[PDB]
Each structure stands twice: as structure tokens, then as C-alpha cells.
Write a protein that binds this ligand. Structure first.
Ligand SMILES: *C/C=C1/C(=C/c2[nH]c(/C=C3[NH+]=C(/C=C4\NC(=O)C(C=C)=C4C)C(C)=C\3CCC(=O)O)c(CCC(=O)O)c2C)NC(=O)[C@H]1C
Ligand SMILES: *C/C=C1/C(=C/c2[nH]c(/C=C3[NH+]=C(/C=C4\NC(=O)C(C=C)=C4C)C(C)=C\3CCC(=O)O)c(CCC(=O)O)c2C)NC(=O)[C@H]1C
Lengths: 315, 313
């Protein structure tokens, strides 16, 4: 039965059990994963409102100094570019990316998107023809099976992940591993099926709009935003569009129990519906840098197109 | 059918026989790169472009005996695996060579039956592609998508004019969006007859998705031999971007005052929906890595055109 979200934990909401999976408000956890930092800022003035508690250690500045400046002063070269790329009223799915040379922290990748009157800024550390070669190989795959196999093998070669699977949704939202590339010694998931509640309905809706999510370390504690609520609204900060957003504790426990230290998946979206997932696993924690993740994002789109094409060749 | 090419004493093309120019087998290439053909098994260099000596820095005869194994040691096994016998002519493999004579070359290979076609071009060596991808996806409708696409391509390439050229059901073309330098004629809104892009050219554009003329006044460079030794027949060059552009079309571009021309096919439901079409007033060799960006954009636009057309119908 579909039911509306509970309030999050920090607003006195209940703790999540196998009874109430579909009601955890996974988009507003009030916290991020510790391998990057996040700031929120007023979309018109550029006043800095919220920051992750670890921000001082990524950005090399005291909180009170950060919060006491506008983005115009903090990001003089990027602030006008942000404002042109992310105009008021734009969708929350639109992202702008730049690379910064920050004194204390080396090269940072900056990813920005806009939710209403809020700008959300994510900072992460950042670092030949493999993509072009893959694009052509995907297109020349003769059928859906060969496409799925080429796609899994390519992603594994690009990333070094222990396991890469193509997980396909059935009409009842149960899913099935239909191809996989895996490290020697791992047991096969190929052909196994899993119940629809393994990925609940409010996750599947979110995964149709925001096409890549990840858990870099399934044992890492989440880092709170400070303050936790958006001071504009005294309400929760929407983090559905932020890759840094904390994974749900239910899902992290599901993964630890499987022996997984790192997770990533790309949505494959066909005709406006979530067709399936490029889901990857690593046994140890593992951070895939932003520019490599971009390659996977591009492959997500290519695969969406090629899945349509291969399936049309099939009636 | 097709007329024989000129160099096999076929008729010269006119506006009476537009549909029968054998544009895939011109026997020549554009001079900003070099092309070798080679045997699929032996790696034996069978044809070369008369200009190969320039790019490769090799005494002419040296090449036309040697083997790819010898000539490209690191690459030759990769090719063997990347382009297995029986693969499609559409499948391409690329690498960057740090080659003694020329700082860096791009190498592009595909296979047509028993022949490997190798293309060499100068090359080199950020977020504009990722930023463009998200911009295309958040365009609210087909019109805005067209506008974003043309603007994005112009910004990435510096081309004087970028258009989105959409085919009607009878192959009548319409310019539905345009991004252009100040002080050019506007082709926005204009329609053009199907015969400007003739049927045999449209078919080839459905399979091989990027072509160009780098300089509309440059002479083609012959293949030597012109005929493939294997077959004593013309080498199919339609999957080669270095393939000499039909003089009928280079004349159409000179009469427009265009010095440089590139286009990317937008393919939807197995059919040619449209073209990203680019003009430059002067000669312009777009480097391979930037062309790759446009090739990606072509696929992304193909996806988004279907998405956007579905939310009208
Ligand atoms: C009471 C709730 C439960 C629950 C919740 C849940 N699941 C997700 C998202 C995912 N679940 C996945 C499950 C699988 N991983 C596999 O490898 C296989 C099969 C071999 C399955 C079935 C996957 C892949 C995802 C997607 C994300 C990822 O790549 O890890 C969420 C949302 C998490 C978030 O975005 O923060 C939630 C809340 N799963 C259950 O089994 C029950 C107990
Ligand atoms: C007797 C045949 C003629 C003919 C042949 C022909 N046309 C092409 C390819 C193209 N024609 C194009 C025409 C236009 N470009 C524009 O900007 C506009 C409108 C403003 C039109 C109508 C285009 C865009 C192409 C695609 C190639 C490109 O990107 O430049 C070919 C094929 C050439 C080749 O690939 O080798 C041929 C043989 N064109 C005519 O107009 C008649 C006289």
C-alpha cells in the first residue's frame, strides 16, 4: 500500500522497520557522506546558509568565516557562470559542474544545482578513447543480451568494481540480474530475482529523475548539515539531487550484510520509466572520482537509447 | 543503381543524375589527413594516399610493402580484437599514437569485409559536455531543445553557423533552429528540396553519422592504387571521415560562401530525423577529440528528440 512520507528522524519521525520501508523520506536525511562537503546558498543574494560539519576541512576555512561571506566573494569566477547556467525556476535535475583550484585542498570538483530559491554546492576532490570505443561497440551489439554483456564488461573495465550487474525491472517492480561481470571467486547473481520491496517505490521514483547515486563506504557515519533545517523555510533541505546525500540506514545495513563496502548504480530510463539499473559493488570502500563518474553517466544515456533500439528489434 | 565512378570512365554528374553519383567510392581523401588500407589477416598495406609520406614521415615504397605488425606493434593486436572478421563497417576503433615524425596522431580504423581502413590525423594532449548534456535534458520542449543544441555546438566549436535541419516526410528539409555569428544571412525558417541531400547520401548518413568538408577549395588526394588489389574494385570509403566530398556538394558550399562544413546525423526509430549542420566561412579542421564530443551529442540529441516528441504526441 502506498502511503505518504514520515517526517525525518530529526523532526521526531519514527525509526524505520521492514513494516514501513516505503515511507522513509530518503531525500531529506539532513546529512551527507564524508568524502565531500556541501554548502547551501540563497539563490539571489548568494548568502551561505547551511554547510556540512566537515566543510572547514575541505575548504580550509572556519565556519563563521564561510557563513559570513556571499558566493560572489567566495567564488568570484564561478558565481556569474552559476547564475547564467541555473536560472530561477529551472528544474532541480539540471546540474552545472566546474573544476576549482583551491589553495588548501588541491583540485576540487564543484557540482551545483538549484532547488527553488536554494543553490546546493557539492565539493569533492578530483584527479583515453575508451568511451568512444565503447560507444561504437554498444551500438554494434547484435541483440539485447550481447548489449547487456558488453555494457557490464565495459563498466567493470573502466571502474575496477568487483561486481557490475545489469538489473532489470519487471512490470511488478521485481528485478532480475540479466547480465553481470564479476571478479574471480565471487558467486554469480545472474538469473536471480528479488522482490519489489528490495527497492521501494519512493526510491524508484527518485531514481527516474536523478540518475546516479552511490554509497562510497557502507560503514561511514553521515555528516550533518549545520544548521539541519534550511533557515529560509525552517524546513528540511531537499537533497534528492545531491550525490553526496546520505544513503538510507536500511539500505546500508542491507549492503553490509551482503559484504559490500561500496555501491553505485546508474538508472536506465526508457519511455519515461525506470527500465533497470547499472548496479556495481566493491568489497572494500571505494571512491570513484567525479570525472570517471561522468563517463558512467554518459553510458547510462547511451544504454537507454540502445535498449530502446534493441527492444524495437523484437516484437 | 549507381553510375561507375569517374576514374572507371563513368558519366560526370549533373543536376540530371544527382541520385546516382557514387559518393562512397571516390578513390580519394581530403588532404588534412592520410589513409592506408590493409589486409585483415596479414596486416599488409595494400593502398595508401599519395600524401602518406608527409604525415607518416616514411619513404614512399617502405609503406606499401610493410605490415601493420611491423608498422604499429602495440596497436596491431588491439585492432585484431576490436574489429573481428564479420563485424559491421560502422564499428570503429580509435587510438592516439606518439609517432616520431608527428608529435601525436589520431588513428581511426574500421573494417569492410577483408580490408582494414586506417585514418591518420594530427591530434593533441572539460565539463562543457556534461553541462550540455544536463541542459539538453532540462529543455522543456522540442523548440527549446533545438535552440540549446545549436547554441551548445556553436560554443564548443566556434563554427560560424550551426543549424538544426529537420527532414519532412518527403525529405523536404527545414531549418528549425540556428546559432550564428553576427553578420551572416539567417537560414532560420527556410525550407529546401529533398534533392539537395539526395537519396543515396541520406541512406549513407543513416549508418555513418558524421561527415565533413574541411576546406571547400582543397583538391582531393588519390589512393594508390585506386582499386583494391584484393578485389580489383573500388575501396568503400563511406565509413571514412577523410573521404573526398562530392564536387557537386563542394560546389553547392562554395556558391553559398562556405569554406568549411560539418554535420551530425540525428537518427530516431532507425530513420534519419535531422542533422546538426555547421558552416564556417573559412577552412577549418576540427580536431578528432572535439569531433568525438559532437558524436556524443548526436546520440544524446537522438534520445532527447524522441523523449520530447513523445510529450507532444
Ligand atoms: C525496509 C527497506 C528495505 C530496502 C530499502 C532501500 N533500497 C534502496 C535502494 C536499492 N536497493 C538495492 C537492492 C539490491 N542490491 C543488489 O545488489 C540486489 C540484488 C543482487 C538488490 C535487490 C539497490 C541496488 C538499490 C539502489 C542503490 C544502490 O546501488 O545501492 C533504498 C534507497 C537508498 C538511497 O538512495 O539512499 C532503500 C531505502 N531494501 C530492502 O531489502 C528492505 C529491507
Ligand atoms: C546533383 C545533386 C546535388 C547535391 C548533392 C549532394 N548533397 C550532399 C549533401 C548535403 N547537402 C546539403 C545541403 C544543404 N546545406 C545547407 O546548409 C542547406 C540549407 C541552408 C542545404 C539544402 C547538406 C547539409 C549536406 C550534408 C553534408 C554537409 O554536412 O555539408 C551530397 C553528399 C556529399 C558527401 O557527403 O560527400 C551530395 C552528393 N546537392 C544539391 O544541392 C544538388 C545540386
Amino acid at each position: 500500500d502506498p502511503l505518504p512520507f514520515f517526517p525525518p528522524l530529526y523532526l521526531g519521525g519514527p525509526e524505520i522497520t521492514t513494516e514501513n520501508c516505503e515511507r522513509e523520506p530518503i531525500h531529506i536525511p539532513g546529512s551527507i557522506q564524508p568524502h565531500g562537503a556541501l554548502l547551501t546558498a540563497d539563490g539571489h543574494s548568494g548568502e551561505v546558509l547551511q554547510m556540512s560539519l566537515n566543510a572547514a576541512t575541505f575548504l580550509g576555512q572556519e565556519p563563521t568565516v564561510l557563513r559570513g561571506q556571499t558566493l560572489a566573494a567566495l567564488l568570484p569566477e564561478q558565481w556569474p557562470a552559476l547564475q547564467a547556467a541555473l536560472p530561477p525556476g529551472c528544474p532541480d535535475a539540471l546540474q552545472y559542474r566546474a573544476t576549482l583550484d583551491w589553495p588548501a585542498a588541491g583540485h576540487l570538483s564543484l557540482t551545483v544545482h538549484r532547488v527553488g530559491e536554494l543553490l546546493i554546492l557539492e565539493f569533492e576532490p578530483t584527479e583515453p578513447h575508451a568511451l568512444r570505443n565503447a560507444m561504437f561497440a554498444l551500438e554494434s551489439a547484435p541483440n539485447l543480451r550481447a548489449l547487456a554483456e558488453v555494457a557490464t564488461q565495459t563498466v567493470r573495465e573502466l571502474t575496477g568494481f568487483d561486481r557490475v550487474m545489469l538489473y532489470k525491472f519487471a512490470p511488478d517492480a521485481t528485478g532480475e540480474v540479466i547480465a553481470e561481470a564479476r571478479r574471480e571467486g565471487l558467486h554469480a547473481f545472474l538469473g536471480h530475482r528479488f522482490p519489489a520491496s528490495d527497492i521501494p517505490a519512493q526510491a524508484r521514483a527518485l531514481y527516474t529523475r536523478h540518475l546516479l547515486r552511490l554509497t562510497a563506504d557502507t560503514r561511514a557515519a553521515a555528516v550533518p548539515l549545520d544548521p539541519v533545517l534550511n533557515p529560509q523555510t525552517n524546513a528540511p533541505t531537499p537533497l534528492g539531487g545531491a550525490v553526496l546525500r546520505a544513503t538510507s540506514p536500511m539500505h546500508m545495513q542491507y549492503l553490509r550484510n551482503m559484504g559490500v563496502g561500496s555501491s553505485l548504480s546508474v538508472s536506465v530510463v526508457v519511455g519515461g520509466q525506470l527500465w533497470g539499473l547499472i548496479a556495481c559493488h566493491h568489497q572494500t570502500p571505494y571512491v570513484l572520482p567525479p570525472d570517471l563518474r561522468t563517463t558512467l553517466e554518459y553510458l547510462g544515456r547511451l544504454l537507454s537509447l540502445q535498449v530502446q533500439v534493441k527492444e524495437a528489434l523484437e516484437h
